[PDB]
Short mmCIF file of C-alpha atoms in Angstrom, two decimals:
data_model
loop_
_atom_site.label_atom_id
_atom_site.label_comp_id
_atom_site.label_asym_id
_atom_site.label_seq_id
_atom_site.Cartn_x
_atom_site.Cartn_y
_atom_site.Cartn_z
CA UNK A 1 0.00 0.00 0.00
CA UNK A 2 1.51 3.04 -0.89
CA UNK A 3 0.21 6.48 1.09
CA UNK A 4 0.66 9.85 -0.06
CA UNK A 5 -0.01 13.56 1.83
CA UNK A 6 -0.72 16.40 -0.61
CA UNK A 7 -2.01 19.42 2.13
CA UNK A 8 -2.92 16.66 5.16
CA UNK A 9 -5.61 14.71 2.61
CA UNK A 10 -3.18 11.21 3.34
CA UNK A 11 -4.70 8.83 0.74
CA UNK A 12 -3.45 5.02 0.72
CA UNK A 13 -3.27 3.53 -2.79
CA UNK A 14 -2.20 -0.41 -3.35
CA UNK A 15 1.00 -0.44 -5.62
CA UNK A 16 0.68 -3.82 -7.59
CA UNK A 17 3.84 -3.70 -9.10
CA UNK A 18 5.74 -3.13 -5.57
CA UNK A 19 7.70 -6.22 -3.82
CA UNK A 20 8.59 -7.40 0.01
CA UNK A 21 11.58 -9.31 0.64
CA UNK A 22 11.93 -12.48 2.37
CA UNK A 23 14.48 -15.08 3.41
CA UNK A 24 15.37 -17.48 6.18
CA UNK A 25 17.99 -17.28 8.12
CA UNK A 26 18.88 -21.15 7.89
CA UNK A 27 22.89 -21.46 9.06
CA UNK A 28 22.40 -19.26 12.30
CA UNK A 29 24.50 -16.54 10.93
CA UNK A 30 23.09 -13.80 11.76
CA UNK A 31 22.26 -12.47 15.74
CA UNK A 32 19.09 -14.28 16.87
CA UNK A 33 16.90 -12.12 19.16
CA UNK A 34 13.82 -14.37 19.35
CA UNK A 35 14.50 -16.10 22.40
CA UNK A 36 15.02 -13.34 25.09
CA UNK A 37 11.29 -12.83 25.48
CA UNK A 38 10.78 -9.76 23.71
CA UNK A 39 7.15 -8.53 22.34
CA UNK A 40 6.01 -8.71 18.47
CA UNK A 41 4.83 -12.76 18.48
CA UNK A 42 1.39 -13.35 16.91
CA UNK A 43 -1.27 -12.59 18.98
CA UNK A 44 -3.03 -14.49 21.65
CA UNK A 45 -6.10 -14.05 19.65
CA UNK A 46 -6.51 -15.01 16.48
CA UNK A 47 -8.28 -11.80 15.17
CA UNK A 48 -5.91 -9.40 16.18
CA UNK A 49 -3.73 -8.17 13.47
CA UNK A 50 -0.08 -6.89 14.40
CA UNK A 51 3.04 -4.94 13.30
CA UNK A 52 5.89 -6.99 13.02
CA UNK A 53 8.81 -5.90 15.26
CA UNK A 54 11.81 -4.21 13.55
CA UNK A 55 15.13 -6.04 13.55
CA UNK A 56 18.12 -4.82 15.30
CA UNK A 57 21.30 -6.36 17.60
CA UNK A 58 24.07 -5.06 20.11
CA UNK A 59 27.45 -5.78 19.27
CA UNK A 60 30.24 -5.37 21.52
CA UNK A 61 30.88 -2.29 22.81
CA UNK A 62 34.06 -0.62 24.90
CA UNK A 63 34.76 -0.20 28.51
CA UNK A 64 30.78 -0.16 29.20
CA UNK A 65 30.27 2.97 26.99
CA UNK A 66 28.67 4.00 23.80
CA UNK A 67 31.71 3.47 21.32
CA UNK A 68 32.52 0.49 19.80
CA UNK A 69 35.48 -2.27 19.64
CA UNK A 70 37.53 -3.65 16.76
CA UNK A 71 35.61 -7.23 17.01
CA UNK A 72 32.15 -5.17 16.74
CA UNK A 73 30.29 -6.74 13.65
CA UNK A 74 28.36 -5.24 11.51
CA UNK A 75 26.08 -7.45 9.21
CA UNK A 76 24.18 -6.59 6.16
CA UNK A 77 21.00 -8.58 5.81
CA UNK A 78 20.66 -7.62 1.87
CA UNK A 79 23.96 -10.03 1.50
CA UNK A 80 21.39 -12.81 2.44
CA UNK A 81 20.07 -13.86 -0.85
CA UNK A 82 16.17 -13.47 -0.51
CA UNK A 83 12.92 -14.34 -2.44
CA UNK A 84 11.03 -11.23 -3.65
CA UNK A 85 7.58 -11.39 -3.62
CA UNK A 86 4.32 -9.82 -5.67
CA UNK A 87 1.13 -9.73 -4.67
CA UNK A 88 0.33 -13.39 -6.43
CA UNK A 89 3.58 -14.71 -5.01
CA UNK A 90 3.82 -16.86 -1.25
CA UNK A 91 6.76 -18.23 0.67
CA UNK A 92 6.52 -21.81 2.35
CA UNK A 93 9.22 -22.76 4.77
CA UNK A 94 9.50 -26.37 6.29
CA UNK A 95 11.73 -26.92 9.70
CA UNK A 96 12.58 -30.09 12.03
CA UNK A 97 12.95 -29.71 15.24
CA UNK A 98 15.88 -31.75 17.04
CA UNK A 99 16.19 -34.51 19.64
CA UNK A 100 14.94 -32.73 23.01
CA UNK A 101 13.47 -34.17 26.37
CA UNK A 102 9.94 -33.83 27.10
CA UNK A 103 9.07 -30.91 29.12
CA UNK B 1 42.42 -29.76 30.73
CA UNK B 2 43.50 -26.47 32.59
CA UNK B 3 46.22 -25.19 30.76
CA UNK B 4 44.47 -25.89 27.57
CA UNK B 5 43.87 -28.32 24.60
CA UNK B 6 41.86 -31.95 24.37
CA UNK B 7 41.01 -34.33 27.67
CA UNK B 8 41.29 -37.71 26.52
CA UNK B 9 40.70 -41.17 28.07
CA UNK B 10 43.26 -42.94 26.06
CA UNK B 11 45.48 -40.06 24.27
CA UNK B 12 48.71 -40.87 22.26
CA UNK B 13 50.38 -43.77 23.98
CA UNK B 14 53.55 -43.23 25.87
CA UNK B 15 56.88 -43.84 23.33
CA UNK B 16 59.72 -44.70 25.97
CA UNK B 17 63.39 -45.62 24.76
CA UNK B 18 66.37 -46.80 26.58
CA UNK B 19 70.30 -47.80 25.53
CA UNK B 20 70.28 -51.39 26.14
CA UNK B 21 73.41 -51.87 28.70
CA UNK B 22 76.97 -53.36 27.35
CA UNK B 23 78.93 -55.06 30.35
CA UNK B 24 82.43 -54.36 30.74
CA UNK B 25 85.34 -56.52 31.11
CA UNK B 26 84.61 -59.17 34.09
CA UNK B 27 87.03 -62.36 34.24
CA UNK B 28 85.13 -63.62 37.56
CA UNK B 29 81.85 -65.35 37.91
CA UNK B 30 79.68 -63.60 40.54
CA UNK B 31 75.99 -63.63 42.07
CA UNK B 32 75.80 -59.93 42.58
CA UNK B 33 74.81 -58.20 39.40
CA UNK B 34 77.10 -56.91 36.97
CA UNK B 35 77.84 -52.79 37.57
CA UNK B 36 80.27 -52.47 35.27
CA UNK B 37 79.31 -50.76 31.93
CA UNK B 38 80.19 -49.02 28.43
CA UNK B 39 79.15 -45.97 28.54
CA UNK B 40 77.78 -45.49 25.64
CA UNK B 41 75.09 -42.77 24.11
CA UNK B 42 72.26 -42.96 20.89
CA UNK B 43 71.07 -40.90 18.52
CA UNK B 44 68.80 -40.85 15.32
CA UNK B 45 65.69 -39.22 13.99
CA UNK B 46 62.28 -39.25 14.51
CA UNK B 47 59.37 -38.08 12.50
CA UNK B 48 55.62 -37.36 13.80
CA UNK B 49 52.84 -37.23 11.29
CA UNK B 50 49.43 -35.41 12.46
CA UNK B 51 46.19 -35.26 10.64
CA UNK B 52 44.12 -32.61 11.61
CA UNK B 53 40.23 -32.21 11.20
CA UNK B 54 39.40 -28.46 10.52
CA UNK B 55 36.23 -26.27 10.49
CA UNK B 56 35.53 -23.80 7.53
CA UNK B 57 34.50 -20.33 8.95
CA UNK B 58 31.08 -19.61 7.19
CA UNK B 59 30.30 -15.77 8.59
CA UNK B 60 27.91 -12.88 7.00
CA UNK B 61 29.68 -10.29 9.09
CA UNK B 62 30.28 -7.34 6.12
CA UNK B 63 32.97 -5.60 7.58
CA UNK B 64 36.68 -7.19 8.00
CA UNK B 65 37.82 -8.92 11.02
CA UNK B 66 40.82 -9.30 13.35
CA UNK B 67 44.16 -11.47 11.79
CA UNK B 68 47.03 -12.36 13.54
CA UNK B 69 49.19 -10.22 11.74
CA UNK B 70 53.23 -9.67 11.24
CA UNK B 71 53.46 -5.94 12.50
CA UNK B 72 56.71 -4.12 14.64
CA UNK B 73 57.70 -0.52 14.81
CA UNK B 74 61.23 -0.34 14.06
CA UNK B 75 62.42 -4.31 14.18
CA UNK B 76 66.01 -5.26 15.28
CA UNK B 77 65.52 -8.74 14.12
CA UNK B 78 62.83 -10.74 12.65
CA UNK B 79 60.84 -12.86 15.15
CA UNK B 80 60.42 -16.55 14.83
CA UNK B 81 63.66 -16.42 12.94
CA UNK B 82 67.52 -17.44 14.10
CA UNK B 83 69.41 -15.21 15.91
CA UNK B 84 72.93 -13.52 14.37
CA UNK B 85 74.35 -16.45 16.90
CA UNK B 86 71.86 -19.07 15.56
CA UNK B 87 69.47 -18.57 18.24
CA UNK B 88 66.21 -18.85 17.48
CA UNK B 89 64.06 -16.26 19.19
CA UNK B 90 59.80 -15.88 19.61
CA UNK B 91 58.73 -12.47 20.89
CA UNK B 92 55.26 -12.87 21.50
CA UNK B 93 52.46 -15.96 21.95
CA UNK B 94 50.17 -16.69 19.63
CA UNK B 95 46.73 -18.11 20.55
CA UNK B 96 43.84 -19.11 18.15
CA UNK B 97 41.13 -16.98 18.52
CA UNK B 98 40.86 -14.25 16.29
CA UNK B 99 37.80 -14.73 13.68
CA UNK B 100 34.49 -13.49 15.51
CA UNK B 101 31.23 -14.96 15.49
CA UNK B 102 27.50 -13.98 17.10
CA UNK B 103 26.02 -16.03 20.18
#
């Protein structure tokens, strides 16, 4: 959807031709956030729609300050090849989980 | 291990070498054992073949990383080299952890 303000009118138009990006991270290379308990899951409820959270990780830093090190990483997420997707276009994903004890 | 490296129930067996003794002159028979020797002294060469099982580094970081790197301000002598006597001389230690990878 593509939204436009011309003098506070803010229309929303769908842009057909437009694309989203997707790809799974499947060799753990990047920083993985999801397990520190942090909000943006799908809801509780099955008809509440929801943003998805924006993506973002600390690196080292020095002497407990602001400024960085010289082993603080920065990675690009474009340098991931991705699948681009139109609006008649879907992603499928398939995953097994490994050996674990019964909670 | 402590100090470093691989704990092993049954590492490298133990390689143990000894000059097998040479009696010297006796003209007498006599029950006490024979103290009396050659003194004698081996030498030789021994070579050790390893094979080693490595891991490739597969990282997305974008920006370069840390190397263990050949660098001295003003250098007297080369390190790791022979001395002008023959001596050979290592400044500094050298461990193995340089490349950087995310949690």
């Amino acid at each position: 959807k593509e939204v436009t303000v011309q003098d506070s009118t803010t229309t929303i138009a769908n842009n057909l031709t437009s694309t989203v990006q997707v790809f799974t991270d499947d060799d753990y290379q990047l920083p993985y956030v999801v397990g520190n308990g942090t909000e943006g899951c799908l809801p509780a409820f099955p008809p509440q729609v929801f943003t998805l959270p924006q993506y973002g990780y600390a690196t080292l830093n020095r002497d407990n300050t602001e400024n960085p090190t010289e082993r603080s990483s920065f990675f690009c997420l474009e340098y991931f090849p991705s699948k681009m997707l139109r609006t008649g276009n879907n992603f499928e994903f398939t995953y097994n989980f490994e050996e674990v004890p019964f909670h | 291990p402590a100090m470093g490296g691989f704990g092993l129930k049954h590492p490298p067996p133990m390689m143990l070498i000894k000059n097998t003794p040479v009696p010297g002159n006796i003209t007498s028979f006599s029950d006490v054992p024979v103290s009396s020797f050659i003194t004698q002294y081996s030498t030789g060469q021994v070579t050790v073949e390893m094979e080693w099982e490595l891991k490739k580094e597969n990282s997305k970081r974008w920006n370069p990383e840390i190397q263990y790197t050949n660098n001295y301000n003003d250098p007297q002598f080369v390190d790791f080299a022979p001395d002008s006597t023959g001596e050979y001389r290592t400044t500094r230690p050298i461990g193995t952890r340089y490349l950087t990878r995310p949690l």
